[PDB]
Write a protein that binds this DNA or RNA. Structure first.
Lengths: 433, 432
DNA sequence: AAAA
DNA sequence: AAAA
């Protein structure tokens, strides 16, 4: 899958010129048709400001205005119609109207928008054109694009290209070259944020104290997230710290996450007052970092959902999950920890012993010296700490126990053990931020 | 230490407006004084396109012309004397001149320029303004800033703020708000890319390929990296994978890296052909990714230079280094591995035993026929693998061995061991 | 806790 | 809001 994103300003104010790209040449007011010809994308994404709209009779009338205007422009230029248009919440006081709100709303809106567009299965080749864009929309789109591709890179190969044209001077210009200003193999960056406090999901921009308190107080998200917070932070830490069993046991509910993001996005959408007479759009609620963290969390869940399996978790399963999620010394320490339990399972099996629901400490034959559960031992042993994990060997007739022990040996956090791991991994994720 | 960086285009064509920022107000043509007034920066940086240069005699009368007119404009609105001015190489075909070259040369030049300005000690509060910026220069300056602060974040606390004002619209404009577009705690990202092939340090933009090969041949830098490439990638791997002994032993020569960069820099600049009559700059050499990696490598070395402790490398010193350099699970892995060697060294000290110049396998007491050095065992055991490391205990009169053993127990790689580790860590960094 |  |  190849993906072309373009940051656009006011497209009706652009001059006809000549564009050079990949040896091909193009006459027109936009870089898009030559970008599509050369790159041949599987899908195109256009990101432009809300401020281009010229109708204030409704918020949806303001977006059907801007959309139709873009649909005309794509016909004027040789551009296709396989396109998604993201109408981002823009700021300022213009000749044809006024738009107030948090400037950071565009980041959270575009992040949320791109989250539902960027494919969650297979490799990504992403092309970003900034020739036509506004400074602050372009930077926040670049940032929102990168942050998601960083989570995509955990499971899949992600190459990122960025283009800007030669600068346009009124009449000195004859041909503009479309230059590659970036070419990057996106590094895998799993989410390393804790869920923030319940002030930083939706904030009041221009709203009376009592009215905001009623909206905030009405949200199912904040009520639910209060109790679900620790487990989601335990899962976030599972990817970051190299804990393959906690990844599986703490895999989040995608439906519930989808529910939280739609609820907040809708409260924000509904809190936009479009004053039809005096041509003013006021976004009376602003998105917080908490909304951003949730969007990223659900994206990481979608990216990695294919690894999840049913409740009996074998050492062979933890091996394969680990080889996908982890790299470098994190991966190799996990393989050594699974290896030590595997090699012990093999010894038991040679003797015709198949222990069931036994603590890992009793499985590996530890001393009675330490039963306390430290962050040191939890983090250092890929979360397979001796005092929290329970082991069960399903019985079989061994002929080559070296290769069949892995499938028949299962690991499980004790109900007490899981809560000790949750506290440690949650606290460590919050202390590392 | 608070830092302020601003992205500027053509600073003359801006009109008088007033600005609102953080419970203050200001009148003038740029946001810099009201930013300085609220932010209270210990230093200011200004990144410009060199395309605004008018007098074309040669390169020093372009970086003069622009620095002249920047310093005139900074007297007009009282920006003070605490300012650094980066005249980044721009491209295009303009009213008063023509600048040709690679679009990406601005990134590497600003990266290089920023690598020498940004403090390499103490916490950082970086403030960034995109109000006045060109499209590409602002985007590359932003990326250049983030790439360096990510490495700075390894050792210090780095908070980053970005600003862009309400859009200046000439009719119906009363006052523009300085909007905060970004506020983030910068995540520690240690350098995680190998040094490339000796192709991609300088590339010919507009140089006949026979001339480039001649020039690439006269560079001492590429001939010196030929040797060092592996030993430097091993050091890069040391930070990324949590290998504290390899970090100390492979610690790069800063004076030497300084001389590589300055040579690649002054070579690039010496291949800029200015033509006074045609009014045309041409940057015949382009900066490659290899130049960027060397600047980032040097910056990471400056950031972590304080940790290069005096020899020999004791368990106590390795703990101290590790406690500063590593986080999360990687730190605990390293602490557990130093704890294994420490606890053994205590058991030895109790019996009155102080082994000297002993392989770590013999120190820990290992079976035969596990002498093959696997990537698995080097990366998984904080690079302290039993077949590559040599332990020494300087004999002492113990009183509390549990406290004393850490100081008196030294670790080093065997001459053969270090090359296998270098090979393993270099290879692991390339598969990335 | 690698060959507690 | 193709160099506020």
């Amino acid at each position: 899958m190849k993906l072309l994103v373009v940051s656009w300003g006011d497209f009706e104010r652009w001059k006809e010129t000549k564009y050079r790209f990949g040896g091909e040449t193009s006459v027109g007011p936009s870089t898009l048709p030559i970008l599509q010809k050369v790159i041949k994308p599987d899908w195109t994404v256009i990101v432009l400001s809300d401020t281009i709209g010229k109708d204030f009779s409704s918020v949806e009338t303001l977006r059907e205005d801007v959309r139709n205007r873009v649909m005309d422009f794509l016909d004027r230029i040789g551009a296709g119609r396989e396109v998604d248009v993201i109408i981002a919440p823009g700021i300022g006081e213009f000749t044809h109207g006024s738009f107030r709100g948090s400037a950071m709303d565009a980041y959270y809106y575009v992040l949320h928008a791109l989250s539902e567009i960027i494919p969650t299965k297979g490799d990504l080749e992403v092309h970003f054109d900034s020739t036509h864009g506004l400074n602050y929309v372009t930077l926040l789109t670049y940032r929102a694009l990168k942050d998601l591709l960083g989570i995509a890179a955990v499971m899949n190969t992600v190459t990122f290209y960025a283009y800007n044209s030669d600068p346009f001077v009124p009449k000195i210009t004859k041909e503009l070259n479309i230059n590659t200003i970036e070419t990057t193999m996106v590094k895998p960056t799993p989410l390393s944020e804790p869920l923030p406090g319940f002030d930083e999901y939706l904030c009041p921009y221009s709203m009376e104290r009592a009215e905001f308190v009623r909206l905030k107080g009405s949200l199912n998200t904040l009520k639910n997230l209060r109790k679900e917070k620790k487990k989601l932070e335990a899962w976030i830490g599972s990817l970051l710290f190299g804990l393959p069993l906690l990844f599986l046991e703490e895999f989040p509910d995608i439906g519930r996450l989808e529910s939280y993001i739609e609820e907040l996005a809708e409260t924000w959408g509904g809190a936009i007052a479009v004053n039809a007479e005096e041509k003013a759009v006021t976004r009376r609620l602003a998105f917080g970092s908490g909304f951003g963290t949730l969007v990223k969390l659900l994206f990481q869940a979608r990216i990695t959902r294919g690894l999840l399996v049913e409740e009996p978790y074998s050492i062979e399963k933890l091996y394969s999950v680990s080889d996908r999620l982890f790299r470098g010394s994190t991966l190799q320490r996990v393989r050594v920890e699974l290896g030590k339990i595997e090699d012990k399972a093999i010894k038991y099996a040679r003797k015709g012993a198949f222990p069931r629901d036994i603590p890992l400490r009793d499985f590996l034959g530890f001393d009675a010296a330490n039963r306390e559960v430290s962050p040191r031992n939890v983090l250092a042993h890929a979360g397979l700490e001796a005092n929290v994990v329970e082991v069960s060997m399903e019985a079989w007739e061994p002929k080559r126990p070296e290769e069949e022990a892995g499938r028949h040996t299962h690991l499980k956090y004790t109900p007490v053990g899981l809560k000790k791991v949750e506290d440690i991994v949650s606290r460590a994720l919050k202390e590392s931020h």
